[PDB]
Write a protein that binds this ligand. Structure first.
Ligand SMILES: COc1ccc2c(c1)[C@H](CC(=O)N[C@H](C(=O)N[C@@H](CCc1ccccc1)C(=O)NCc1ccc(C)cc1)[C@@H](C)O)CC2=O
Ligand SMILES: [Mg+2]
Ligand SMILES: [Mg+2]
Ligand SMILES: [Mg+2]
Ligand SMILES: [Mg+2]
Lengths: 198, 120, 196, 222, 204, 212, 222, 233, 196, 198
């Protein structure tokens, strides 16, 4: 082990998530989408224990979608992340905790700013210019500490991400089968389906 | 708690409390729906007893249950909110378990079941 | 701990040492191990102090309630209340109790409730860590229907031996005499019983 | 295993059942558990079967050597002392439990030895899983001054108790009789009360039932 | 992970009328993974046959050890080792390793070149001798083999009949065991000649 | 156990072995590892025999209930999610199952879901499951094309279970074969490995590590 | 620590004929190396022409048989005396077993009767309710001894037609009740020889389109 | 989670031609301390049944109360409580077996092994065993603890199968019981010279013998035993 | 096991019961626990039978070598050899030995070597699992300079109490009398000592 | 866990061995040669525990080379492999066994046959048309059971391997960084040094 990275540029948040699903000695799948859209301007990626992962994401998805319809309104990224943190904080002391770590990337319309939150299974939340869960951060935080600028464009961010994915392919012991990359800005969430050989 | 029966049968075979419930609907503002060839339209009348209202924030009578289904009513306004909430919950739950939004018939069967339950 | 109860001609006597330890430290050298649960029903406690105090307190509560409603409880009734508590809670109790009482009809009686929660009616009983050293001696020296002063002596000799060998036992020898007369507390000091 | 030793007025007898097991499975239905230490000193073992065999043979070997060096008949108290010191040194790890018996120029002797190296002397003894069933019989019927016949009967009945009642024991009764007068007499399958009944049917296959892929003659000599 | 179970294999041996047979499976696995279809478990020193089940490295090592020792024996005694004698050699060679034993269940089969009487024996891993006159079984399907043999066996079978019995004992035992099978060879041993046959069997 | 399912041009091949074991004991050679839930839905079983048999039979019940309730056949997605959600309720209690839910509906097309007792649920075109999975994968993956004929796809499935039955000590017995179409499962027979191995060796000229 | 499970030994065997079925079991009940009883039946007539055995830990076996006999009683009450068919019994027993999935019955169970068409039927369960219909099955302590015999003598496995160079197999015929009882008796005398937990007695229950018939044979008592 | 504290060793029993015999010694042990000596472990229920109990003595005393309550309760609104609706050995047994099995199934056992002996109302002998696991079995002879290993082999020499039971007299059977008790006193370190014995007979009813003692013990041969091998004096 | 040695006017007496148990099974009901290491130097063994037999044998060998080179060893000397063996191999031994011997200069002497391998010269000593039950009794009834019959009685009573309470003790009571006179073996049976 | 594959065609033996060396969370080398030449016609490949691996291989190499120079003669593959086996079998029972698995591929010039021996750290030896150590065998054995023919050319053997590698790059969790391939035939040992982007 599941790569989950995030970088916040000037006008968007970019999420990249590995495609592999591995059980034991077999890669069962190489196109896994470790993502749920929570609302048209908020995306969540996740990694952790086998079943908990999707169950948690979908449960969160159901809850935010419920709010949207009740209020005919879209919760801010900050609100969704607080909501998510609290669910994890409760879970950590329950009978069987959710073992899931998440990235939340959102575009806030009230402020017109991208926002990236990193939350681990304990309910530790932080807002970051860039983040990662698992081992991948052991490579990417230092790379980005060097190459990252606050005023990068979306295309600059995608280059910076290409650099991170290169580093991981070179140094990480596991084959994670490339990533799926998603951009979240004012015009919503879109997938860059060309990254495998871009 | 308190579960003393209030809705029971009349000598001639009606459930009085349900019948009087229909009376509350009769005195509620009017609502109408008609279906086109490729659409459906919902119409409602707003009362004239008080006219210094703020329309921005006053709950309107048509409600989204999901992004593809709507609900309007006639009768006790506060009563309708309990139904709209449960229907919204059910609709998310159905997307969660069956991986598909509800059919309009499904959602109706569901609301109707809630209503029926509250008669017995 | 060394504790015993002995039936004699006119009733029953309970005796104990007065040492409580936590490890090799003597936490209390003057403990009172003789515990009244009714006027003429007493017990000696061994095992966990917390457990046996909590039990003795509950029994005392039950016997007061019993007396209010039905009159003086028999010693058997007392023993049965202890047993119920000990048996039913055997999995979080470390309690060995000896119950001793006097009444008019049944005279002096002794029951021992060891670790299991079993009950045993006996002419005399010994218990506590120190008791293992006096099995031989007590069996050789006990007789039924002894006089008061003979019985006081038997307990005195018995427990001085128990104290001599067991490091957990010691201090003063306390006793309670239970008869028609009456309730009498006796105490005996090292300087006396060590010279026996 | 059930093994016994019984002293009578002019000698000592030993007996054993003939079942060896491997957990719940019977490996050998007629194994010999009565070993010879020397012509007139015999031995029954229980526990690790390889250990009782090996320890019996090592000591038997050395006892022969001792006997040649000393020009004397071997003594039971020597088999005993060599067995016990060997076992002790092995702190239990050589798991042999033995009833050792024999006659020698000083008389008849009956001993037991345990894996850790302790020994005991008696008039009647039993070892192994059937030990308790055997002892019930010994304690019920043994008396001082048994004739040779009575002792063979007692010993044998005691093994029987083991065979029927102990699941670790079965098949047959082997006896060995050591009398002060004469030679030791090994009496193999003294009793055989467990003959397998005639099978209901023969399972002889018609020839050519088994499919063969290929065949060849194998070379023995050079 | 118990060493007598890592590789899988069975060996069985039966006596018949003036003959003996010894049969074995050919599987060499590593836990679930079958590795080789040609791992024979039967060997012969002069007219004396040895089959060995258990840890495969020890099976090889033991064979090489007994080749060695029967070669020297032949050079000093100027005659081939006999089954009875070899049995003792197996037994004490195994016992020599009492506290770091070879993880094996060896089986001996042969006819006495002097007396002409058939002889089989088995051992546990520390040399204890099982001295049966009818059959001896060994390996990860030993329970099944005891089952087949006790039912199928009868004394005084002619060589061609004995071949049927031992093959059918082996095959049906192998088939109720996950770790044995994948091929079988049967040796029919007559004083005079030795025929070795490969059996056709389920390859699962 | 080895079980597989793959999608191709002409639908779905489902293939399973039939061996049951306890430890190294072979418990049965004739066990049924496919459950015919309804005429358009199949379930495959690996792991705990009881766990699998019990919960997939139960899944059949829940699927029938959906039909009565909704006057329509349950989607592959929803049938798989029922079993997924059940199993997830039991997480950490020691349920042991690896499972494929395979079927056709008009709305979905031919669909495979893999579901296990850890709660994983994945949609995909190719799955092999059980102790023999890697063996099945080796043959299957190296000869798989989308455009395989029905005849070839049936053969490849058959040939992949045989591969695994041969190498994996815990697979074997027989192959049970299924084709799932628009119309939609068809049973293509039980094939004993006893005969199938020799026949395939002969006709294909493969299995050269085998004497005979 | 308290261990809620034990092991009572014990071996059972089911064979299905064409229009009959049998269920056999030895009558010996053991604990460790001791014998509890030489005659304690463990094959039961459950009514509706169904026989049952649950072998292993005898307290769990008894509990299950009781519980199932009770199922049969309540089936009559709630379904207007309908006969409980063998396949329906099987499915039911699966729910009984699987109901205790997280505190199982330590039994391997076998039932035997006739199916809807009057064909002999045999069903066998693992301890947690996995089940199958089979032509025959051995369960319990000596199962690993007896099953392969059955594979060979009931389903003619590995037997080829003589001379066909192994292609034509011995064709799978049906066996008479006489032939079946022969195999049963032989299977058990075999198992008694090689397994220490098996012996004393054999009780066979035969089921036909006229009810349930009992047969008994002495087994070796060692 | 529980462990026996005060215990009491074998209970042994057999059927003879007309009834049953059961015996048990009078000791309650506290590990290796022979602690209490007047302990009765034979429990008569009605006059056609005796329950013999070994194992934990606190649990034994609990099962005494249960059996007394059972007699009280069967008498309630039952005019035939001392005739046709008297408690039978088989009812007492089944009840106890049920309790035993339920308690083990709750992971909280009654730490005992129990033998129920008596004669049914149709004259049939009843002899059955249940223990802390709810395991039950029946046999012409039955014993718990050491008695299983040492008394059974002796008792089985007398009654080896069903067909031996019309052939065994009260006298022969009681002789075998008394002798087996002596063997247990010889070899079981948790036993006692004092025991009780009960005969339940289809003609005689219930004879309950108390304060029996092992007699005719052999100890004389001990004077000849010196050392542990070589020592002569 | 219940063992003791008692000095008296004319020498020393050793006493033991005759029971060996493995668990609750009595492996030997007539064991002889009185062990000769020299004409008038005997011991009693408790702990592992393997361990105490091996030790006794080595001591015996050692004392035979000593006699050959230097004359009868003293009882202290015998105790010193036992002690050397016990102390030096304490880590792999479970050995509790009571050594008793008669000597002309020294008369009767008793040494006890407990589990550590320490040595203690005492007027009398008791050991084995059974001895706990008789500490009080023995301390109450022992006097110096008792006559032969008094000492036989003191040991007879003491051991019978130990046998009554200890499940690991039983059988016959064996004694060895060691005086100038000589060596005398005594035996007392259950029917005899249970009454006492 | 290192891929160690061996296939024996008609006139040669081919060994393929992974290039990755990974410790913990890092791939330290992507070009490791997991092979030692034992003599001009005998090559050994090895996998297992970190230090043991090369130490054992170089030790075997010294010993064969010594024998070569002392007899001015090359030991047969069969003889080399018996030596290796016995070495492992002695080691397995020593104070700290060698944890090393090996493939031995050689061309026997006296016989004119290629030969492949598989030996595990226990000293388990077997001669095979194809072999593998570790996890990789769980994929390749069945693949080769199907596609392998006894009379293939060296060129066909190389295509058989391409498949084996491809399958392992699809289904194995870890990135083994491709393989080094070597052929042992009548001429000797050469490296097919162009297999990864081939
Ligand atoms: C108290 O005794 C217990 C308690 C708990 C449990 C068992 C016994 C069980 C005993 C038991 O093993 N029972 C056996 C079993 O489940 N075997 C497994 C392999 C072992 C296995 C693998 C993974 C998880 C559990 C078990 C098997 O053959 N699976 C393939 C297969 C798939 C589908 C079908 C229809 C049949 C077979 C049956 C065949 O007798 C395991 C279990 O849960
Ligand atoms: Mg003190
Ligand atoms: Mg297989
Ligand atoms: Mg039906
Ligand atoms: Mg048997």
């Amino acid at each position: 082990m599941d790569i989950i990275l995030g970088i916040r540029v000037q006008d968007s948040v970019i999420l990249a998530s590995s495609k592999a699903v591995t059980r034991g000695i077999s890669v069962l799948k190489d196109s896994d989408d470790k993502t749920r859209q929570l609302s048209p301007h908020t995306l969540m990626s996740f990694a952790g224990e086998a079943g908990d992962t999707v169950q948690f994401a979908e449960y969160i998805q159901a809850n935010i979608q419920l709010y949207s319809i009740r209020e005919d309104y879209e919760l801010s990224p900050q609100a969704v992340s607080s909501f998510v943190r609290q669910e994890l904080a409760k879970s950590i002391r329950s009978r069987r905790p959710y073992q899931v770590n998440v990235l939340i990337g959102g575009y806030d319309k009230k402020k017109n700013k991208p926002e990236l939150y990193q939350i681990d299974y304990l309910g530790t939340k932080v807002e970051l210019p860039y983040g990662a869960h698992g081992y991948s951060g052991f490579y990417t935080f230092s790379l980005l500490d060097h190459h990252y600028r606050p005023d990068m464009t979306t295309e600059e961010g995608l280059d910076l991400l290409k650099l991170c994915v290169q580093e991981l392919e070179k140094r990480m012991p596991m084959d994670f089968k490339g990533v799926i990359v998603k951009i979240v800005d004012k015009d919503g969430i879109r997938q860059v389906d060309d990254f495998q050989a871009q | 708690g308190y579960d003393r029966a209030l809705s029971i049968f009349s000598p001639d075979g009606h459930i009085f409390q349900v019948e009087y419930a229909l009376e509350a609907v009769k005195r509620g503002t009017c609502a109408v729906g008609v279906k086109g060839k490729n659409c459906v339209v919902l119409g409602c009348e707003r009362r004239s007893t008080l006219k210094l209202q703020d329309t921005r924030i006053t709950p309107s009578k048509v409600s989204k249950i999901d992004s593809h289904v709507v609900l309007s009513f006639s009768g006790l306004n506060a009563d309708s909110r309990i139904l709209i909430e449960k229907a919204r919950v059910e609709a998310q739950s159905h997307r969660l378990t069956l991986e598909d939004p509800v059919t309009v018939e499904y959602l109706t069967r569901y609301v109707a079941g809630v209503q029926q339950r509250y008669t017995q | 701990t060394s504790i015993m109860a002995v039936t004699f001609k006119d009733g029953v006597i309970l005796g104990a040492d007065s040492r409580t330890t936590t490890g090799a430290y003597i936490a209390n050298r003057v403990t009172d191990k003789l515990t009244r649960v009714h006027d003429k029903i007493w017990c000696c406690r061994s095992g966990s102090a917390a457990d046996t105090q909590a039990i003795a307190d509950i029994v005392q509560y039950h016997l007061e309630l019993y007396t209010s409603q039905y009159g003086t409880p028999s010693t058997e009734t007392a023993a049965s209340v202890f047993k119920e508590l000990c048996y039913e809670n055997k999995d979080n109790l470390t309690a060995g109790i000896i119950v001793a009482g006097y009444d008019d009809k049944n005279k002096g009686e002794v029951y021992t409730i060891p670790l299991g929660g079993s009950v045993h009616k006996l002419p005399y009983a010994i218990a506590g860590s120190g008791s293992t050293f006096i099995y031989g001696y007590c069996d050789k020296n006990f007789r039924e229907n002894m006089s008061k002063e003979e019985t006081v002596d038997f307990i005195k000799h018995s427990l001085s031996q128990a104290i001599k060998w067991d490091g957990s036992s010691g201090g003063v020898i306390r006793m309670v005499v239970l008869t028609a007369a009456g309730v009498e507390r006796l105490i005996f000091y090292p300087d006396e019983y060590e010279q026996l | 295993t059930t093994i016994v030793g019984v002293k009578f007025n002019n000698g000592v007898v030993i007996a054993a059942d003939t079942r060896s097991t491997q957990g719940p499975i019977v490996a050998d239905k007629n194994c010999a558990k009565l070993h010879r230490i020397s012509p007139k000193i015999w031995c029954a073992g229980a526990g690790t079967a390889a250990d009782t065999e090996a320890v019996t043979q090592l000591i038997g070997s050395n006892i022969e050597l001792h006997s040649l060096y000393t020009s004397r008949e071997p003594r039971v108290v020597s088999a005993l002392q060599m067995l016990k010191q060997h076992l002790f040194k092995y702190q239990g790890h050589i798991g042999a439990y033995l009833i050792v018996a024999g006659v020698d120029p000083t008389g008849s002797h009956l001993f037991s030895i345990h894996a850790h190296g302790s020994t005991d002397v008696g008039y009647y003894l039993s070892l192994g899983s059937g030990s308790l069933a055997a002892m019930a019989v010994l304690e019920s019927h043994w008396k001082q001054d048994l004739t040779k016949e009575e002792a063979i009967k007692l010993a044998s009945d005691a093994i029987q108790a083991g065979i029927w009642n102990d699941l670790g024991s079965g098949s047959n009764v082997d006896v060995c009789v050591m009398e002060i007068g004469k030679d030791a007499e090994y009496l193999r399958n003294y009793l055989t009360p467990n003959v397998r009944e005639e099978k209901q049917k023969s399972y002889k296959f018609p020839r050519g039932t088994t499919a063969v892929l290929k065949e060849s003659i194998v070379n023995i000599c050079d | 992970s118990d060493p007598s179970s890592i590789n899988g294999g069975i060996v069985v041996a039966m006596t018949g009328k003036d003959c003996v047979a010894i049969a074995c499976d050919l599987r060499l696995g590593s836990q679930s993974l079958g590795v080789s279809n040609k791992f024979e478990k039967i060997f012969h020193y002069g007219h004396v046959f040895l089959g060995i089940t258990g840890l495969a490295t020890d099976v090889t090592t033991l064979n090489e050890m007994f080749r060695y020792k029967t070669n020297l024996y032949k050079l000093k005694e100027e005659r081939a080792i006999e089954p009875e004698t070899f049995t003792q050699l197996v037994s004490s060679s195994l016992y020599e390793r009492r506290f770091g034993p070879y993880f094996v269940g060896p089986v001996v089969a042969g006819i006495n070149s002097k007396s002409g009487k058939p002889f089989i024996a088995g051992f546990d891993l520390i040399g204890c001798i099982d001295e049966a006159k009818d059959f001896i079984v060994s390996g990860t399907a030993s329970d099944q083999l005891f089952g087949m043999c006790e039912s199928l066996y009868e004394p005084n079978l002619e060589p061609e009949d004995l071949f049927e019995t031992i093959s059918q004992a082996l095959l049906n035992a192998a088939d109720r065991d996950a770790l044995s099978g994948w091929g079988a060879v049967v040796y029919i041993i007559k004083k005079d000649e030795v025929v070795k046959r490969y059996l056709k069997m389920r390859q699962d | 156990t080895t079980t597989l399912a793959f999608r191709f041009q002409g639908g779905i091949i489902v293939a399973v072995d039939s061996r049951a074991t306890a430890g190294n004991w072979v418990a049965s050679q004739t066990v049924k590892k496919v459950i015919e839930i309804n005429p358009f839905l199949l379930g495959t079983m690996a792991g705990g025999a009881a766990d699998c048999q019990f919960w997939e039979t139960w899944l059949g019940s829940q699927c029938r209930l959906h039909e009565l309730r909704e006057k329509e056949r349950i989607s592959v997605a929803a049938a798989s999610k029922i079993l997924s959600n059940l199993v997830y309720q039991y997480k950490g209690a020691g349920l042991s199952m690896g499972t494929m839910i395979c079927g056709y509906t008009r709305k979905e097309g031919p669909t495979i879901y893999y579901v296990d007792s850890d709660g994983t649920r994945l949609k995909g075109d190719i799955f092999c499951v059980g102790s023999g999975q890697t063996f099945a994968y080796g043959v299957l993956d190296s000869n798989y094309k989308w455009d395989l004929s029905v005849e070839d796809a049936l053969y490849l499935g058959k040939r992949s279970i045989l591969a695994a039955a041969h190498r994996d000590a815990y697979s074997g017995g027989s192959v049970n074969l299924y084709h799932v179409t628009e119309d939609g499962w068809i049973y293509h027979g039980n094939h004993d490995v006893g005969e199938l191995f020799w026949k395939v060796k002969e006709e294909e000229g493969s299995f050269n590590n085998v004497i005979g | 620590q308290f261990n809620p499970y034990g092991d009572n030994g014990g071996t059972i065997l089911g064979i299905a004929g064409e229009d009959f079925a049998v269920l056999a079991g030895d009558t010996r009940n053991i604990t460790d190396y001791s014998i509890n009883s030489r005659y304690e039946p463990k094959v039961f007539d459950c009514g509706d022409n169904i026989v049952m055995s649950a072998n292993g830990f005898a307290a769990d076996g008894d509990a299950l048989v009781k519980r199932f006999k009770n199922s049969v009683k309540w089936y009559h009450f709630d379904h207007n005396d309908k006969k409980l068919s063998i396949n329906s019994a099987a499915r039911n027993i699966q729910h009984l077993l699987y109901g205790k999935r997280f505190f199982p019955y330590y039994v391997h169970t076998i039932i035997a009767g006739l199916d809807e068409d009057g064909k002999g039927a045999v069903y066998s369960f693992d301890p947690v309710g996995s089940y199958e219909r089979e032509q025959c099955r051995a369960g319990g302590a000596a199962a690993s001894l007896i099953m392969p015999f059955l594979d060979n003598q009931v389903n003619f496995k590995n037997q080829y037609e003589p001379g066909t160079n192994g292609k034509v197999k011995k064709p799978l015929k049906y066996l008479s009740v006489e032939e079946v009882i022969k195999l049963v008796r032989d299977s058990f005398t075999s198992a008694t020889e090689r397994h220490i937990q098996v012996g004393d007695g054999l009780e066979i229950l035969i089921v036909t389109k006229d009810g349930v018939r009992k047969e008994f044979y002495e087994l070796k008592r060692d | 989670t529980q462990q026996p504290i005060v215990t009491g060793t074998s209970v042994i029993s057999m059927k003879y031609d007309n009834g049953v015999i059961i015996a048990a010694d009078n000791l309650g042990s506290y590990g290796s301390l022979l602690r209490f000596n007047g302990v009765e472990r034979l429990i008569p229920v009605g006059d056609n049944t005796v329950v013999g109990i070994s194992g934990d003595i606190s649990d034994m005393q609990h099962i005494e109360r249960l059996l007394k309550d059972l007699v009280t309760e069967n008498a309630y609104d039952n005019p035939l409580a001392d005739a046709e609706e008297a408690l039978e050995p088989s009812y007492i047994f089944e009840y106890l077996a049920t309790v035993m099995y339920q308690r083990r199934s709750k992971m909280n056992p009654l730490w005992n092994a129990i033998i129920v002996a008596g004669v049914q109302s149709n004259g049939d002998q009843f002899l059955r065993y249940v223990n802390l696991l709810g395991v039950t079995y029946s046999s012409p002879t039955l014993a718990t603890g050491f008695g299983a290993h040492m008394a059974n082999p002796l008792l089985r020499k007398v009654v080896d199968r069903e067909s031996d039971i019309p052939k065994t007299t009260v006298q022969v059977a009681e002789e075998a019981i008394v002798n087996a008790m002596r063997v247990l006193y010889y070899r079981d370190a948790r036993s006692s010279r004092n025991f009780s014995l009960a005969i339940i007979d289809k003609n005689t009813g219930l004879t309950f013998k108390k304060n029996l003692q092992v007699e005719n013990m052999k100890w004389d041969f001990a004077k000849d035993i010196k050392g542990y091998g070589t020592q002569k004096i």
